[PDB]
């Protein structure tokens, strides 16, 4: 029935953007939350680390002439916005969700705390991690590996705009094939794009396997959770 | 020389958007900052309260489907992003600035604390207040009034897309006139929309005068603080 | 049986003062807590926003020559004292209660957080909100509307020294009559005293109805909760 | 010239009450502040620990019926109120003052942090410590000792309703004498109540000398810091 | 069956040191946690205040030339380390444990809060109090009395390297006898070593009885909890 | 005169241990501090990131049996202890220093905040960063890089038990040579272990140059900041 009991779902801000060129598209987020809700109702404990690219865009231009760290702090503030909207959407579906921020925040969100988050998962709630790792110069993928290892998740579900890992950029090379399973070293030796070095190393060092898939492809989240053939499995 | 020593300048997030559809427009924010950097060098202590309408656009549509309290929190997060961008802008021009948030932030900003805010104002720095009043259901203009009165500002400068208060909409009828100066009661009596009732009410009770004025027009700010004829002055 | 499931009870500090000229009168608070306990045991979820006038009195005089904001901060510190004593009194009756402060406090009380407070209500505990809205220049009534709207309460129970809304000050006009029901506009058109403008506007804008009643009039809290004829109902 | 450079002055909340039955008496607080403003201008770094007995009166009766830990917390809240009032008083006389709380406060005060407190003392400001030790069951005098030793104060000044330590109660017998100077051991041996045992014990272990003295008597403070004959000196 | 329902177990850092000359000895802590686990599974609610002498040793030498307060802060940081390891050890045995610090800490531990800790005990979890009282110049024993009184524990279990209270130092006087029961005054009159004055006074003033025993003596924790003859009972 | 104006000096906890088996060795810490106190007086702004290996030794054995996240937290607590000891050392030599923690601490230290850290650096103070990145699974060297780049340091000084990077281990073969200067890519290509990959990767992306060098050797630090030939320089 269920292959992965506890998962850390990594969603980029862009995933909530749909076709729009900025922000959150109501239809996309509803479709996404609903799909996550489905696996939760199947009893899966879900942890979500969400990015802020969809909202950073509106401030990307100015970022250029800003101190990178500061630009990154705005990015983190952007994730919190997606975290909030994401939670609101779950409550609408009858699923309770809690937002834990890596940087302490008064009323918008609870501060990250391992014991509480684990509990929340157990209590059947979706835990949404905001503000990445709390530090600049680190990617969302990195924050996903960190929270994943901390939450003792069975695997990290890296959701992307491609339904898996290809021998080469499929969107620009129709003859590209999707790997069904690959190793960390293989991914490296083959210069395959899975995630940034730092995040990749963290997943290895913590023995956190990764499944790359395309969330927007209706039904694949459930397929991966159930063990069907979907996306690429990267293991150590 | 100087008409107003300490001023609380209210900036809508939209005033940093320029002609863009969303976010922060580089040339616009650089222009606005520069103009304030001008009065600052003239010995004016300036506190800023900024909205998040420009960034809120990308999540506005979704907001409608969300709880309002949660929507306002996203609005407050948006203002933090503008506050950082603004703060960084000032540094580039050699001016020192600090970001105070109504809600506690870990490393993005310092929590609001009157004694320190006033402290900075004396040290001749720019203080940008973010997160508004820290509470949902309150408008940015109310935050400005709150902070303006708390900071013991000589006047609140309401920057807007108009150079003053008119007896009628000039854009949709070039036959009206720009009030040079009105009184709170007259404004209310003549249904002149200066700001929402709560915000407006606070200024009166704290006896904080307002000066509505378009900041896009170069020189406008420089004019108001010097005492020239510019924008409407709502006083008591 | 029960007309209002979730209520925000607004108690002024003076209500806990009884006949004494300052502070908390043991007999009054016990009578008050007991009455609130009764409706909780009937299954009503109660949220309480409490004032500090009864304790502010001792420092009222000095306040006069103090900066208003500072005077207001003392008021907020006063509510926390009533919040504490109020909680202690419930624990004595076997009812668990939690104090959420609008301003973060280390060990005296938990910081306000919407998700937790809602939960507390559901868990059958009385939630007592202290420190108003966290900002100076705002009344307790305002803090009651805010928390009320945030807690999604069915109605706000404004407890006062009069058993309802009269055509004129009853304590000084024996021929005054009590309205059984009135509208927001009616209350305004008639210059009826319900609460301050800001708080009143917030209740309207959030569609939070109000029931004005006299808590000290033994048995009326239960009567209002049950639907009997008691106090004045102000709705939009 | 100056006998004590840095001093930790202990003020009971009652010493701000004057002849009133409760709260803060305007003329009294203005008198007391003024007297300290005097030694401050003389280059004395002054830290203050204030009790809350004056405000605690209005809730004392109820306290008896409450848990003691909770009662002490209300006592600590009371001290914050006096701290603010005191702080404001100093500003009026042109003196800068900061309020450090043992327990974290959001905007009412700054959390205690030694490096900053000492910082202020050097900057020639008045530092008023509130919330005592931050723990229930500890007396105000213990907080004074704690802070006195932490601040590396030359001496702790215990202001009281008496101008010194006597061989017997002078009020209830005008035949005793005011010890000019005693030693901790002598005090204990002769059962001279200077302060509770814990507080007293701390001063000795940290080697912090005490100077009991009535502050109501004009000039008293001025006398002690200058070295004149005034109040008992408990030393080691 | 069970004589003490809720206990505050005071463990010195040295107890976790075993024979080693520094730090935590895996075997000792496992033996200790297991023994505590046994009484928890019997339904006893356990509160633990732990010291840091075992880890302070490594920095004792440098402490000598440091400001005492600072030296004490390092001690508190040391308790947190034992608190952490202590918790980890319980989780391994299947017993949930929470670490509450007297000084607020972001992700390492929850800040001390009476309502939550009581709850935790009730929920069957072991609560471990770290950082003493939060202030320098106070012993661990003192922190044990404080938390004990706050948690309304039935008795404070002072674990030590001696199996009770002797007529004189047994390790250096073979003819020393163990008291089975003694009074506070008796302990004092006889100059018996139970704990430091401050801590002792606090236990008396709060009517918190004390049982002195040797935790390392396998099986005595259970014996004391069950009412058997073990250790010395000090009561008021 | 000065080669590097602002430097981020990385100190392993072991470098404060001297020849001892654990903890902090008085003569060693006094020597190391003194050496830095030297370059500071020369107008060099110095930020420090210190590890906790020296203190972690006493809990290392137990760590193996604990969850790694929890082990790393104990490691971070250890670094706070070294930070305090270090800070105190500087005071003794008349130098002012402040301790910034990645994780919020109540009174032991100030929470990390870039604007203030840079503030201090300009005020000519020593800033000691503790708790590393604030996240588990990240090495001390990564924290150094993070902070180094955040602080806009001219270079990161990696103090170690070796005076530079060699073509081969000199200790286990006196036939190699100390690279005078290498480039990131060369280092990686030649498998020269300078620091873990993540840490190393960050320095390159932020363009932060490293200068590996043994600090035990008196004069070493003094040499590097002046520009003399000392230790390997890994640049881009």
Curated annotation (Swiss-Prot), chains A, B, C, D, E, F:
Known regulation of activity: Allosterically activated by GTP. Inhibited by UTP.
Q: Which GO terms describe its molecular function?
A: ATP binding; UMP kinase activity
Q: Per UniProt, which keywords does this protein have?
A: Allosteric enzyme, ATP-binding, Cytoplasm, Kinase, Nucleotide-binding, Pyrimidine biosynthesis, Transferase
Q: What is its pathway?
A: Pyrimidine metabolism; CTP biosynthesis via de novo pathway; UDP from UMP (UMPK route): step 1/1
Query: At which positions is ATP bound?
Result: 10-13, 53, 57, 160-161, 166, 169
Q: Kindly list the places in or outside the cell where this protein is found, as annotated in its UniProt entry.
A: Cytoplasm
Positions binding UMP in this chain are: 52, 72, 133-140
Q: What is its EC number?
A: 2.7.4.22
On whether Nucleotide-binding is a keyword of this UniProt record, the answer is: yes
A Pfam family that this protein carries is AA_kinase
The source's superkingdom equals Bacteria
> Per the record, what are the reactions this protein catalyses?
UMP + ATP = UDP + ADP
What class does this enzyme belong to in the EC scheme? transferase
For this chain's UniProt record, which GO biological process terms are given?
Answer: 'de novo' CTP biosynthetic process; UDP biosynthetic process
Specify whether Plastid is a keyword of the entry. Answer: no
Q: What does this protein do?
A: Catalyzes the reversible phosphorylation of UMP to UDP.
Quaternary structure, from the entry: Homohexamer.
For this protein, the record's PANTHER family field holds: URIDYLATE KINASE, URIDYLATE KINASE PUMPKIN, CHLOROPLASTIC
Q: Give the family from UniProt.
A: Belongs to the UMP kinase family.
Q: What is this protein called?
A: Uridylate kinase
Instruction: List the source organism.
Output: Neisseria meningitidis serogroup B (strain ATCC BAA-335 / MC58)
């Amino acid at each position: 029935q269920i292959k992965y009991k506890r998962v850390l779902l990594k969603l980029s801000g862009e995933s909530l953007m749909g076709s729009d060129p900025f922000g959150i598209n109501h239809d996309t987020i509803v479709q996404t939350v609903g799909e996550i809700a489905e696996v939760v109702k199947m009893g899966v404990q879900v942890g979500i680390v969400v990015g802020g690219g969809n909202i950073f865009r509106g401030v990307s231009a100015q970022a250029g002439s800003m101190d990178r760290a500061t630009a990154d702090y705005m990015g983190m503030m952007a994730t919190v916005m997606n975290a909030l909207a994401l939670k609101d959407a779950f409550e609408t579906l009858g699923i309770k969700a809690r937002v834990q921020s890596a940087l302490s925040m008064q009323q918008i969100a609870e501060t990250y705390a391992r014991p509480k988050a684990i509990q929340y998962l157990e209590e059947g709630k979706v835990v949404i991690f905001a503000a990445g790792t709390g530090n600049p110069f680190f990617t969302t993928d990195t924050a996903a590996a960190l929270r994943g290892a901390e939450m003792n998740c069975d695997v990290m579900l890296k959701a992307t705009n491609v339904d898996g890992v290809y021998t080469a950029d499929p969107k620009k090379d129709p003859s590209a094939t999707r790997y069904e399973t690959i190793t960390f070293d293989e991914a490296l030796l083959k210069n395959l794009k899975v995630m940034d070095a730092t995040a990749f190393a963290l997943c290895r060092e913590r023995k956190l396997n990764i499944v790359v898939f395309g969330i927007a492809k209706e039904g694949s989240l459930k397929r991966v959770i159930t063990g069907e053939d979907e996306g690429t499995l990267v293991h150590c």
